[PDB]
Design a protein around this ligand. Structure first.
Ligand SMILES: *C(=O)[C@@H](C(C)C)[C@@H](O)C(=O)N[C@H](C(=O)N[C@H](C(=O)O)[C@@H](C)CC)C(C)C
Ligand SMILES: *C(=O)[C@@H](C(C)C)[C@@H](O)C(=O)N[C@H](C(=O)N[C@H](C(=O)O)[C@@H](C)CC)C(C)C
Ligand SMILES: *C(=O)[C@@H](C(C)C)[C@@H](O)C(=O)N[C@H](C(=O)N[C@H](C(=O)O)[C@@H](C)CC)C(C)C
Ligand SMILES: *C(=O)[C@@H](C(C)C)[C@@H](O)C(=O)N[C@H](C(=O)N[C@H](C(=O)O)[C@@H](C)CC)C(C)C
Ligand SMILES: *C(=O)[C@@H](C(C)C)[C@@H](O)C(=O)N[C@H](C(=O)N[C@H](C(=O)O)[C@@H](C)CC)C(C)C
Ligand SMILES: *C(=O)[C@@H](C(C)C)[C@@H](O)C(=O)N[C@H](C(=O)N[C@H](C(=O)O)[C@@H](C)CC)C(C)C
Ligand SMILES: *C(=O)[C@@H](C(C)C)[C@@H](O)C(=O)N[C@H](C(=O)N[C@H](C(=O)O)[C@@H](C)CC)C(C)C
Ligand SMILES: *C(=O)[C@@H](C(C)C)[C@@H](O)C(=O)N[C@H](C(=O)N[C@H](C(=O)O)[C@@H](C)CC)C(C)C
Ligand SMILES: *C(=O)[C@@H](C(C)C)[C@@H](O)C(=O)N[C@H](C(=O)N[C@H](C(=O)O)[C@@H](C)CC)C(C)C
Lengths: 180, 179, 179, 178, 179, 179, 179, 179, 179
């Protein structure tokens, strides 16, 4: 990790945040901390969240999602490499009109996965909870894309891969950017 | 395994079957084979099924259960050591009036357990199937015990351990035998 | 494995074959050998194939399937415990009118699964192959059930669990037998 | 394994041999032993070789191949489930006109695979040997199928899967049994 | 890692970036961060990207590729040791006329690799995706080399190794540099 | 292992011995026992030694070699699949004029391999022993092929693979047999 | 790693670089970064590269080799402990007249090693690539030693160990230094 | 590692170097770096090398050995705990008259150990190399002890343990120090 | 490790050294470094060595022991928790009249342990060395305690555990710290 301030700390001074890993509680804490820090520095200036993530923990993802919606600054989202699963939800959740993808990035949406062991009663309790979480993710995708809930629900049953041009047509991003 | 015929083959001549292990497909296949064999040897004479089992696979247990009900012979059940989970269901599934427990044996009933990984759609499908299998086990226990389904349903939510005299009172066996 | 002749061989004299494990090449060879043997003993007398299997290898399952169709004897199928995946296909593949399930067994049909690693060219070749295998399994289920291909195709996309009475309505079995 | 004689020993009396596993040296010795035994019992009567194999060792497969060609009895081959890689070569190597597939079996041919670690000199020696083995397998397929060598060579570059009716058209079997 | 500023940070002052590892998401983030930092220091001055990489993740590689194309500064690419797979794409993607290789380096291009397990439907979906990715990599190579798409497609079916002089003839680099 | 006598015992009655595995002490003892048994049955009648072996332990191989030379009966050698390393030595060691290869078999000769760890003194002692063993294997090959020792020595420095016809020319076999 | 600057960073001030480990991509990057840094500090002053290495990756080694030939400063090479394999190539690659070995060091040259698994077509492509790499290493050794290519080729077939005085006679170093 | 400068860095100011671990390439590089640093700070003043080592890699040990002889400063050696194998060679290699052991330390000399797997040709090449290395270690011990090479050669065949007073009589140290 | 200087570095300013771990070569280097550092700061002022150790390597322990006797400063030893095996020897090796234990600490002395594998000759050589080491530890304990050698030898044959009061009466410490 090179020095100038480490390279990431230096980019943080330009209000750039990198989400460049699978999303777990550790990564969510780091992303939330940076968004809260940048809001306290200047609540009016745009934040630039670069996304290269295959996704990860739904609850960790929703910690970042609710923080992005709650803070005053607009969060600009930029997809490089890929925004898949929870990564795709965070890309789509950027400020309206300020959601970007680079031209050879890919976006993928799909339903959540789970694991549950134990008594039938407990399996049914956890099946109910994953159902509630799935409906929530459908609701979030519908709100940010403008797609009807029944189209989102049908499309995420299996892995749904999109080029940046397909993601733009879907409403997951506003623009494909090639050159500054 | 001692010889006379190995000891189990010798007891099979007196129409005695030993269910003395956890229930998997291998054990189910062997118990089913012995029941079908004894029926073909004599469809009229009682079979004696000794049960010492903590249970195991539900589908393996229900292969044995349906075979016990399907064959012509009455299947006498005898609990020694324990009949728990699926073992208790097989003990309760003996011919009416011919379900026995030795005095220091224990009987335990409980709801089934499971494990499912994958997409939410698949988890929900497998949760529906475990619900259907649980209802089936409640139906079987109600039928053989004379208890209502709603009482069985409430009683199997947690491990329900019984002495032989409590299992007799519950309707899981007909007699505690001492001598 | 008790002695009388081991228990399985003694039942083989009555033309009883047990498929009571996951299906791999080893199991298919054993089932095929018993089917070929019973045909050579008497080409005209029914064979009784008891099925308790979660399925397994598609090609191993189709070795059994084709042998069941090819030999002269009718193959009576009886589901005990479960007939899932390839097990369900073999249950459905019994002689018309002689496909049975015990009342607490479960039947499940679903699309084939696979694993492939390597170059994009090889992944596409193997994708084409699993597509061909899937279409063949839909055709086999359509033939034996009398269901239309598009209904089978829709139903097997996810795990499709049935009670014996639902399996009878679907056309996978002809009769639910209690006694 | 059931007792009647175990079931395989009983079917061996009817000149039935089951190749129902991946092919290694152990399996090749068992098949060769069964072929030599059946020849000594009766050099005139057909042998029935049922094949359900994903393949395995080339040299083990060629021990079975050469034994099939060498003995006096015709070896009838029957594909059930699958005949892939060396299994497909053994299927195609049955007595002309007596190579059969059950209708839901599958047949697959492909070039051989290898592994070699060590000095450049040794790697080059083993590459020359896999090249020689590959040309030999092409020659065997050409001989038994009647396909030109350059068509075989092109087709086995990648996994080449066939239904029984496609295998019959290719010349790997004579009849799909209905 | 020696100190003057660590050695890499000191070379970063001279607008030198080292890509000297397999490409995963962690490496891509570090390279992109260096490219965005250097652009913000001076959007008009060349960046020098040294490449010694066997490749790695296609999506991680394309994060770097797209960032290289997006920023204002020309990115000079220098191959040392090797540029294989995605390393060869990043080498070929340097500013026109400013793509270099040292004389004993090697360059290799090949089609992408994948791994997929599960239901036929999911295998087919992932086969479609790797096909799309393969066609995109062919398009990128054709663009930066000036080779027709059909020649690239033919050449990447198997590992295509080149000397620096063959790589220049192919259009992957502009000059072999010695001194 | 099928029954008639197991299949191998039945072939042993026709004086057929199968060497179809790597050569270790266990395999060597089995082959020697079969050779000693057949000699005691009839010291005048040929033995048929089928060889499909990648080789193995030099001392285990030389136990077989010396037994083949020592017994009264001619040992006919037949290569099927492969005779590599010690397998090729045993093939070459058959009675003169009675060494055969099937037409798609392969023969391979190479120098011995070893492992030694410990004090320099012990390493040098074991290096000397491996030198002595290698010289002995070159002498055996020269004796049975009629090749000069310096040609054998040059040829076995690396893996030397041969078709049956190359092996005939070399003097490792007498005839390639098709029917 | 003691502090003064850590000890290595303090020696880097005197233009001393330590290659004291097996050569991988990580090590190549660190050596290249030090060579480029020292060139930018002063393009005219000698660099001192101490080599204690058993070797490692050929491509990692050739990244260092090409960097050593490309930079303006003469690279003085000093062998301590050993320079084996790619280590020996880097020792020989120092500025003419400025290649040194300490008197109890050892130098070893040998041909490259590789590993390839997969289809025959892929094995042959990689066998061709390792042939090209071996011929390139022979070319580099011939250039820096003045030995004929055929003598190098013969000598590197097996591990070729040299004392410092033998390495000087071979043309791999210019001087053995004691005090 | 306590701070004042960590404790080792603080003692390095008083020209004290600690060799207190097994000797591998990493340790060799750290000791060589400290010796080269202290020479550049003051080429005339004594260096104090404390040795507590069971030894380790011969080539790593010889990198330190040759550096100790090559630099201008005298290297005082002090044995604490033990100086065994390569540790004993480095102890004996100190400046004449300036080799010390503490009174409860132990010194042990022995021949080198090795390990080689592969072809007979490779084993013989590596037996020759271990012989050459052993002769070189004998020459070094003979030079610093004043013992004849043949006496050293006989004494190192097995583990030769010495008290400090025995080591002094042998010529491995000059003085046993107490207070 | 808290900061003020880390906490250990801050106590080192008060000439406090903590031996709070099993004794290996790494721990000995650190303890020796701290003792040599404190001696160079002030050769006249006491050093306070706190000991909480179950012991460990004999040669590592004897490096600390000899350093404790060799330096000019008195080393005050304080037992806290335990001083077992080599820890007890170091506790007893403190400056006469300045060896302390806290009142709920424990002191244990025992003979050394060893592991040796290989040829009988090597086992006998290492058995002789272990005998010599044991005699040396007996001689060190007799010196510091004033006990006769034959009493020490008898007492250390098995684990000999002592309260601080028993250790004082034994002569291993001078004073139990109490209020
Ligand atoms: C995309 O990011 C998905 C996977 C990483 C591919 C992600 O959305 C997902 O499903 N994650 C799973 C998850 O967090 N599941 C939770 C759980 O932790 O149990 C369920 C409650 C969500 C319904 C991971 C893979 C467990
Ligand atoms: C008693 O026998 C129960 C346990 C063994 C204690 C038994 O009835 C049970 O729940 N077994 C479980 C089982 O068979 N579960 C299956 C499954 O996960 O496949 C469910 C479908 C049953 C509803 C365990 C898994 C053996
Ligand atoms: C039911 O029996 C399925 C089991 C649940 C696995 C079975 O039909 C199945 O899909 N089996 C898979 C299989 O045989 N796949 C083959 C194969 O990979 O060889 C594909 C070619 C089938 C199209 C097992 C689980 C791999
Ligand atoms: C079909 O049977 C192939 C299978 C995928 C194994 C088979 O023909 C194959 O290539 N087998 C491979 C093999 O035997 N390779 C040998 C060997 O390395 O000994 C080569 C020399 C053949 C060119 C192995 C068993 C995968
Ligand atoms: C070169 O860099 C190739 C490999 C490293 C040899 C690279 O192009 C490649 O194929 N990488 C592979 C990859 O990223 N595959 C993904 C995947 O399977 O997830 C494709 C789906 C990309 C769309 C892996 C890293 C071998
Ligand atoms: C052929 O059979 C060789 C095989 C590749 C193993 C064989 O001749 C060989 O070298 N075998 C090796 C062997 O027995 N080596 C002995 C030994 O170490 O005991 C040497 C002492 C004989 C020179 C096996 C692979 C170790
Ligand atoms: C000396 O440095 C050699 C060995 C490390 C002793 C070295 O030159 C060598 O052969 N390295 C091998 C190597 O890099 N092989 C590559 C590769 O596999 O990528 C071949 C292509 C070399 C032509 C290592 C040991 C794999
Ligand atoms: C003492 O230090 C010896 C051993 C560590 C006990 C040491 O001298 C020794 O023999 N080391 C050995 C070694 O370095 N061997 C090399 C090697 O195998 O490469 C030989 C070539 C040296 C003749 C090993 C590390 C124990
Ligand atoms: C107390 O400190 C003893 C053990 C830790 C309990 C200690 O004195 C001891 O015996 N340590 C042993 C040891 O160092 N043995 C050496 C050795 O093998 O190097 C012998 C040479 C000493 C006779 C080890 C730590 C068990």
């Amino acid at each position: 990790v090179p020095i100038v301030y480490d390279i990431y700390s230096r980019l943080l001074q330009d209000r750039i945040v990198l989400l460049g890993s699978p999303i777990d509680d550790h990564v969510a804490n780091l992303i939330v901390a940076q968004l809260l820090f940048l809001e306290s520095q200047d609540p009016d200036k745009d934040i630039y969240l670069y996304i290269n993530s295959p996704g990860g923990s739904v609850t960790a993802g929703l910690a970042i999602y609710d923080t992005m919606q709650y803070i005053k600054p607009d969060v600009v989202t930029i997809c490089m490499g890929q925004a898949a699963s929870m990564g795709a939800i965070l890309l789509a959740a950027g400020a309206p009109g300020k959601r970007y993808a680079l031209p050879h990035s890919r976006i993928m949406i799909h339903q959540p996965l789970g694991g549950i062991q134990g008594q039938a009663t407990d399996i049914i309790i956890h099946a109910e909870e994953i159902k509630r979480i799935k409906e929530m993710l459908i609701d979030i995708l519908a709100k940010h894309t403008g797609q009807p809930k029944d189209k989102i629900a049908n499309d995420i049953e299996r892995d749904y891969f999109m080029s940046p041009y397909e993601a733009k047509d879907y409403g997951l991003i506003d623009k494909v950017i090639e050159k500054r």
